[PDB]
Design goal:
Chains A, B, C, D: InterPro entries: Ferritin (IPR001519), Ferritin-like (IPR012347), Ferritin-like_diiron (IPR009040), Ferritin-like_SF (IPR009078), Ferritin_CS (IPR014034), Ferritin_DPS_dom (IPR008331). This is part of a larger assembly, with 4 copies of chain A (about 170 residues). The first copy, chain A, contains 5 helices and no strands. Chain A has helices at about 10-35, 45-70, 90-120, 120-155, 160-170. Chains in contact: A-B, A-C, A-D, B-C, C-D. The structure holds chloride ion (CL) (4 copies), fe (iii) ion (FE) (22 copies) and oxygen atom (4 copies). One chloride ion binds near residues 5 and 6 of chain B.
Amino acid sequence: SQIRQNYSTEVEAAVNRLVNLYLRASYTYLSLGFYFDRDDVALEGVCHFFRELAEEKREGAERLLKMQNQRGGRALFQDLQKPSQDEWGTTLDAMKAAIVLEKSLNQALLDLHALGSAQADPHLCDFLESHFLDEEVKLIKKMGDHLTNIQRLVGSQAGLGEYLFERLTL
Amino acid sequence: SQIRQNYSTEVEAAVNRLVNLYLRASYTYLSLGFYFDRDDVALEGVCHFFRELAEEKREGAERLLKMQNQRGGRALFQDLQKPSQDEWGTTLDAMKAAIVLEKSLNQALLDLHALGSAQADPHLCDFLESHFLDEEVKLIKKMGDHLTNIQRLVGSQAGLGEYLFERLTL
Amino acid sequence: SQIRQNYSTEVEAAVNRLVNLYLRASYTYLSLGFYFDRDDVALEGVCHFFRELAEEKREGAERLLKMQNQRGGRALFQDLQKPSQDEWGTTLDAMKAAIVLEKSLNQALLDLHALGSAQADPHLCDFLESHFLDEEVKLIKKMGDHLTNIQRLVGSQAGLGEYLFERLTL
Amino acid sequence: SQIRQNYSTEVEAAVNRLVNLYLRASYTYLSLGFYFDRDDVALEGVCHFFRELAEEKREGAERLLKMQNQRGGRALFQDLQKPSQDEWGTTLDAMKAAIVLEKSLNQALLDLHALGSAQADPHLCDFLESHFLDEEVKLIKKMGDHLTNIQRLVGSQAGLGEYLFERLTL
Ligand SMILES: [Cl-]
Ligand SMILES: [Cl-]
Ligand SMILES: [Cl-]
Ligand SMILES: [Cl-]
Ligand SMILES: [Fe+3]
Ligand SMILES: [Fe+3]
Ligand SMILES: [Fe+3]
Ligand SMILES: [Fe+3]
Ligand SMILES: [Fe+3]
Ligand SMILES: [Fe+3]
Ligand SMILES: [Fe+3]
Ligand SMILES: [Fe+3]
Ligand SMILES: [Fe+3]
Ligand SMILES: [Fe+3]
Ligand SMILES: [Fe+3]
Ligand SMILES: [Fe+3]
Ligand SMILES: [Fe+3]
Ligand SMILES: [Fe+3]
Ligand SMILES: [Fe+3]
Ligand SMILES: [Fe+3]
Ligand SMILES: [Fe+3]
Ligand SMILES: [Fe+3]
Ligand SMILES: [Fe+3]
Ligand SMILES: [Fe+3]
Ligand SMILES: [Fe+3]
Ligand SMILES: [Fe+3]
Ligand SMILES: [O]
Ligand SMILES: [O]
Ligand SMILES: [O]
Ligand SMILES: [O]
């Protein structure tokens, strides 16, 4: 590559794997979204929340791919595994699965940051800082908040709690 | 008829019966609507939902009648039977009765489509496709959703659930 | 399902497979798009054309999933295979691969239409008619046109032809 | 200096040398710009591209000088060497010389970042991250793209290719 400079093969590979993880996450959110749109689940606000996250994760992958091209790396795509479940249980179960997912993306972002630091690649480090690490921290906080409110609600009267959360928070 | 072309007597008759079914449905919804406006039921949002459906069904009948005239068929009207109940129970009972009603209209629309197909009447088929079959599918989905939410709500505290559904969904 | 009516398991399954094919197509277009954004390929208009198609195919899948929920079917997601190539050659090679892809989606849409017809499912038939079959026909025509123009251009002076196509058509 | 804090003499010196390199680059671009404005070269779009880069590099130097004052360092200016050529050959030759130049600025920015990291100077590191490293990466990508397009064009018919690039890309 005429342009490639200070961009290790190790970072390039890790960026490709991070793209796969974000597309996998987007796919998980698409599945969570359409589950909550089932006539026998019918929580539109929960569906809308997850459809929006499917879009953000897809945009995450696209920014990574653009960055990969800008540094002179080569995008390589792999099979995208299907989501870990076909049915996602209650809003509580789903929001728990979403926090697990986001923390695993976050950890992957931190691992890549560590690698960039080890390879003295400040451009990589700054690009993760600017566009990924703060968004993940904010999102995980918002999910933790939602989780707390769902739990407080689904003490007695679980059905009533799920409905009220969907109507008044989402 | 100077204009009538490729329009069987079998289709004409079935269109007249479909008009009767839509007017009967409109009448059912008028009765459901005013039941929920009773001072001893007093669920305004439920009343408004059914009054709106009374209007859509009436419009359904009018489009069918207009189509019948456009093809050179002859509208024939019959007695309209009164609704199947005088009192409609809870929001849950009503929404169940409404889904039963809509599925019976839907089936009548499918039977007429089958007949149009058998008679090689693509105009009839397209007119049902365009104006009736998709609307019924969307409406039945919306009713199934409402039904799911009512059920989730009326676990314990049935009165509280019915109130919240009316206030926050309808 | 309280709502499901005239929706065979055979159609439900075929809809799920069609969703997989559209997501696979979207993924192919994402890969074609970022290939043309490589510093050593650098045909921005070609990149933009394929990124737009990635978005349309994703929207295709989402409309199918919404329809599946509306009929009372159950979305099931599978692994998404990676695109058939990692590097896509010239604009000519890419546009040929895109036409092959679209014709395979089109054929899948026709097969599903045939099945809907066999199962007397006019709602399915109309939904494919309205939202998929005409778009595919228009898109394939636009790709055939592009292909003809690329070929006319890359007689002698292949590099000059590819550049001019990107600048003046895309 | 009353204000100077955590700002090593090693960083101060390196900032002064980086200022010299950016002013030298600005001067190179001024020379490239006016070469392409010669009546016997007459590629206005190429002239405009390089004049714009002369301005960006000058602005780069000014931001560095402002930063040097903000940290309590002392700007020191040195002789600015004249550009490495008096005539710059074809658009292809010029864009190659420009990529070489930018990569040498980029490397200087990375070396300074490394030094800031070694000296535990996070303000320096963040200031380079924010205002210099991403701009260089984007610019080098844009130059690599331009280079690819020029090369594709100047296969046969070099004169025709240079003209078309200037008219339709720049
Ligand atoms: Cl290097
Ligand atoms: Cl006739
Ligand atoms: Cl059935
Ligand atoms: Cl100090
Ligand atoms: Fe959105
Ligand atoms: Fe966003
Ligand atoms: Fe968004
Ligand atoms: Fe967005
Ligand atoms: Fe940093
Ligand atoms: Fe930083
Ligand atoms: Fe109205
Ligand atoms: Fe209407
Ligand atoms: Fe209306
Ligand atoms: Fe109206
Ligand atoms: Fe038809
Ligand atoms: Fe778009
Ligand atoms: Fe679209
Ligand atoms: Fe679009
Ligand atoms: Fe769109
Ligand atoms: Fe049809
Ligand atoms: Fe049709
Ligand atoms: Fe300017
Ligand atoms: Fe500027
Ligand atoms: Fe400027
Ligand atoms: Fe400026
Ligand atoms: Fe830092
Ligand atoms: O977004
Ligand atoms: O309506
Ligand atoms: O779209
Ligand atoms: O600038």
